[PDB]
A paper describes a structure:
The gp43 DNA polymerase of the RB69 bacteriophage (RB69 Pol) bears primary responsibility for the faithful and efficient replication of the viral genome. RB69 Pol belongs to the B-class of DNA polymerases and is closely related to T4 phage DNA polymerase. This high fidelity is achieved through the combined action of its polymerase (Pol) and 3′-5′-exonuclease (Exo) activities, which enable stringent selection of the correct incoming nucleotide and excision of the mismatches resulting from misincorporations.
Detailed analysis of the region surrounding the D714 residue reveals, however, an interesting rearrangement of a hydrogen bond network propagating from the site of the substitution towards the catalytic center of the polymerase. The new conformation of E716 appears to be stabilized by a 2.7 Å hydrogen bond between the O-ε atoms of E716 and E686. The D411 residue, located approximately 15 Å away from D714, displays a large rotation of the side chain and a slight 0.3 Å shift of the C-α atom. These rearrangements are most likely a consequence of the new conformation of E686, as both residues are spatially close in the native apoenzyme structure.
Residue numbers in the entry: 1 to 903
Write the structure that this text describes.
Amino acid sequence: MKEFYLTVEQIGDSIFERYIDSNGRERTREVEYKPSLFAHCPESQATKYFDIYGKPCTRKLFANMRDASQWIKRMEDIGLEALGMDDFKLAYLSDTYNYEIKYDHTKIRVANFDIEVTSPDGFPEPSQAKHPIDAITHYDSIDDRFYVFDLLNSPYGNVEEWSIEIAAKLQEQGGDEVPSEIIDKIIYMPFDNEKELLMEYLNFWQQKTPVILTGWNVESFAIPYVYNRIKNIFGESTAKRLSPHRKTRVKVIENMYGSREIITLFGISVLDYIDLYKKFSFTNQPSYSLDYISEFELNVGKLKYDGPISKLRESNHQRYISYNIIAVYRVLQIDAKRQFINLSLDMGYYAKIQIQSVFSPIKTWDAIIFNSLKEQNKVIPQGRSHPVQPYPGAFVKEPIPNRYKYVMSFDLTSLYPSIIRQVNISPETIAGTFKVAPLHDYINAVAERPSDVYSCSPNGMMYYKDRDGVVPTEITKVFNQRKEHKGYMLAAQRNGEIIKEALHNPNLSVDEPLDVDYRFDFSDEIKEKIKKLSAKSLNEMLFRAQRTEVAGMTAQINRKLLINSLYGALGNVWFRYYDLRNATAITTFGQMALQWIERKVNEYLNEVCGTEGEAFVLYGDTDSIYVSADKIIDKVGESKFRDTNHWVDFLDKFARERMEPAIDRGFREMCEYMNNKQHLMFMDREAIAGPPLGSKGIGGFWTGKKRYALNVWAMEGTRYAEPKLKIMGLETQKSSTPKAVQKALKECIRRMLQEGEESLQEYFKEFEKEFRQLNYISIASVSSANNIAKYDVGGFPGPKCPFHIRGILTYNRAIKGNIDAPQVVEGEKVYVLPLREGNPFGDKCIAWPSGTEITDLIKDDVLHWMDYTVLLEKTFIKPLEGFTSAAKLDYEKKASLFDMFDF
Ligand SMILES: Nc1nc2c(ncn2[C@@H]2O[C@H](CO)[C@@H](O)[C@H]2O)c(=O)[nH]1
Ligand SMILES: [Cl-]
Ligand SMILES: [Cl-]
Ligand SMILES: [Cl-]
């Protein structure tokens, strides 16, 4: 139709495939696949196959996959190279889908679910599944229904059916406000016991077996928990029924504290959306909790509730179930906006790989390159093992801590992939080495020019300029595909307009939507036929034109990801095409590039500004420099500017018309120094920051590498109505920072940058005065409770015991056998508050489970012995002092000679 695959797996000598057929129905076949590998062969043996080094290869076709494996072992034991794709799944997909795959998302079943498990303490262990599962919400993309399984009787409390009528009402009516677009989509099912529930879920699972299985923390929590819960109740044979092929592998992960389990379900592609989100979204974040990211994207959040989640079922079972339903919806809502599932599908099919393999750049790119080469009848190298040898990364400049009033930043386009292309860095294009000087000698163009014949990197490598590098060529293919699918996206917008504009006064005539290609600008005979169309037709035609512009969108984003994920592969020892010298050629070219243009920008501005030896470039990171514009503004006289936009415009134009062209001369020269294959170092202006004109604000400041704040007015072409605060590494969003302090610090920073020292002082005085009337929870710090027992000594602090752990210990002694409520669980977060001397708790601090109130047993006592002074000093004043000191400011007004006079 054509066929495409859904999932593929290798079990024994058989490939197990789930796929949509010619008729568009989901099917499953088991194919005894017959793999071919390749071996080097003599000058004479002659054929169409050659390895990437141009050495002839003879093909070996095997009886089964097991023999092919034996063969590799054998080849490699002798010492012979064993070439070809040793992951037979990719070879299967490559042979079975030997054409560009087009897929129908709607035929692919995407399950999106969430579990709830009441436990006494709150945070149940998935590998143990000790506690009943008391709510499952499983959204199905095919049905577009939410399947809610609700346990009514449980040792932790017997409750009664959730109310879909209440769920719908507003807060005021004691409603949960489950959105209308959803309410009708909910298929509620309650159960008298857990065994009943699970069995029903398991069977529901066979009837609608997910292809892509997602949700939030589904890999680390939901999936193992459900798996182990069932393994524990019904035994393993039953638990394995969560795999279409009844095959399962339990992998363990290790870290500083515990060991996670991660269940591999053969026949299913798990795309945990938190990982998915982390890896596809181009913005780092302080939290990746569902609620935070939901707030960030949707502006709404997860359902609110009273008390701990560990008590929400007994206390408010209504809210509990509605909250579960919404948690799932939020993930859907985010995906409806961000579209990472489809992006995964698009990428998966493009590379011809298990969809989940979008999490593995080495795997993804290996497939892409393997396929590309296969069609040239080329043979891929055998993967060789290598030591994990660290190597230089990116240049980061040590900023001089200070205020920086006017600032402009420039960065480099797709730096690493650009360098790969410019230098022509591939395993087979390596042509030699040169004797190498220290890096700074190449930076300053003082070292002897490396080569007049080969393309060079400052790490002392040389590459051919004639040949066509496997790698560089392959990432160019992707730069082109991106340009191509933006074409489509635009022609599909200029076509949406042509459609929108005949919709004003169509004909009432009855006709059909035209059969045209929306990727290309409508011809003339279609320009007319479109007028004569009816509303109903034109309306379909637009839905189609828009759907196309969105396929253009997806495709071009997809390419950006591939492009950007390549270098990560190249520096990974497990990559087929890894080579340490190449990884080093790239990163140290980068360092040279940034510092060389750094010097170039400095020379230019000193010159152009009359000065000599001024340091214009104040900071730099990887592929972006930060230039101080103070002397450029003074050179013109600030007095000459009508308003903020006046000076912003001026710098925009100054960067565009003078700096950028100098910058480009600077890079063309570097290209020639290194005799590179082509110039691809393109640096353009990004941000324009500074105080509003005529105000007292400082514009911005740096406390050190990656720690700084700027008041930005322009980001490339786009300019902001109100300036944007660019804050980085100042911990004004870090989880530990008390919520009130987070808002207070951002405000301080804003005032410093936009209004001045006096405004800052006004606020500091303001917040200090207000501090002791705030809710204790908004001013408490947050920490993770790691190694609790390690520092537990008869209930008292051990040696080298962290401050927050001490708080937890103080807390445990105060709640020794009570409600019990609540309990501090290992690995989880806690609020932390200091205590004054001579408190009943017998220590200088106390910590309790975050997101909860302090049990009434001790709350008021705690609040009475809070050390506000220490709290304010450690959490607020300490950080603020760091800022002010760096920016050369006083947050408290200095004594004056006129202090005594009563003006
Ligand atoms: N040309 C080529 N064929 C390969 C490679 N790896 C596996 N093959 C096999 O070659 C056939 C395609 O020519 C398929 O049956 C693959 O199984 C490779 O790296 N290059
Ligand atoms: Cl983003
Ligand atoms: Cl971009
Ligand atoms: Cl704006």
